[PDB]
């Protein structure tokens, strides 16, 4: 179809890191959306559904309070400003492993050439082990 | 202008030790705070951003924390190569401002210096001044005393020293000493000697030579 | 690989004028702003300013306002620092570092040392220190700094010690670089230290044997 679209994914081999990946089955880069420096490039002005999900996993809890945070940023072409659009926080800890997912979703108007960044603070805590657990995506509407 | 004050201003720790340095901001900067690592005479390497976020390819043992005014950088397990100076920075409002830096030095098991002595290059003597060099190699801790002796005559005022920063592999030091005199006083007295003392060595150690 | 490579620095004379270039590679140059940070010799980090690479507008710190100016050649991916009316107090390593507006700095230029000084450049001298065996070079009587030393053009790093320069009574610096080798390697393999001094005249290399 004709709308700018992306659904991209964490990279299974990417070593302990969040690397957004469209070369995959059931993954999308289309209609001018580019993946540049691990960010989504908005090809045109409009309204975009933006969404991301990360799934964190620990084995047990180390002795610090852990704050897992997951964030989608808009880098505006002209101003060159990084700004929070979507952010959520989780606090997993207070033998056996734990799993905290985070979902982010929303509708904003984006200028052509704007960039979207899906990022988290602790890549050591990231589980992409099976598929569909870590993904970044937008489609214009 | 937002102050950033790191504590301590420097610290020693053993390899494997948890290490904390703390940053306090003269105003609430929220989470807009970043930590940098500068190894000596290198550019800064970006470590953490928006106060907890890790930059890619940066080892996990690094964790940033805090919000409000107080922030802490934490090295989980200290490593020989974590030897560096670390700067917190606030980007909340202009101008950007940095902490004053915190030196992180590694503590390690005692090492005794390798002593080498260097008659000056003939090419120098030709040009008319002269230099004798002593190399203390790969030792710890940093204190060493280098006595320049020419046939038991203890020199002074005439010689300088340079010392390395901590080698990021083994966390040791190395010393270069230089004894300068013109060719006029090259041939001057009997021995050209270098005596060294370090608390890794059995008894005070000279290593030497003579001319020609 | 993102790369900021800087140059233009080196000796100047007081009241003088200098332009610094930060040449960026490996990213879209107009996708990020550029920060200018200077660091005094051994002191901490001072933020001079930021420039938007897309629309070209800079922002200056109050101290540096107007006495320095930033500019761009977008098309060659280089950012500029114009420095004028330089005082001895201005001596520093100047850094370009990439970042968004009012945000952190991910990539830093290797830095380049500006020396504001009345004196004139002095090219190094260079001398062999001839012999587990250790050996080295010595770089006497040069001003200003920096000086870099490689060995075998960079094919020998293991064991290389390059000392910080002392300041001699001369007013002139000097430094030595050494390295240790095995005691059988003497006579067989080829060891030559390669000394540069860029802000002045030079490149040099030196053969070293008993």
From TrEMBL, chain A:
Entry's Gene Ontology BP terms: innate immune response; modulation of chemical synaptic transmission; necroptotic signaling pathway; positive regulation of canonical NF-kappaB signal transduction; positive regulation of defense response; positive regulation of protein localization; protein localization to plasma membrane; regulation of developmental process
Span covered, complete protein: 84 to 232 of 232
Subcellular location(s) of the protein: Cell membrane
UniProt membrane topology term: Single-pass type II membrane protein
Sequence similarity: Belongs to the tumor necrosis factor family.
Post-translational changes noted in the entry: The membrane form, but not the soluble form, is phosphorylated on serine residues. Dephosphorylation of the membrane form occurs by binding to soluble TNFRSF1A/TNFR1. O-glycosylated; glycans contain galactose, N-acetylgalactosamine and N-acetylneuraminic acid.
Organism per entry: Homo sapiens (Human)
Record text on subunit structure and interactions: Homotrimer. Interacts with SPPL2B.
Protein name: Tumor necrosis factor
A GO cellular-component term linked to this record: plasma membrane
UniProt superkingdom: Eukaryota
Role noted for this protein: The TNF intracellular domain (ICD) form induces IL12 production in dendritic cells.
Transmembrane helix is among the record's keywords: yes
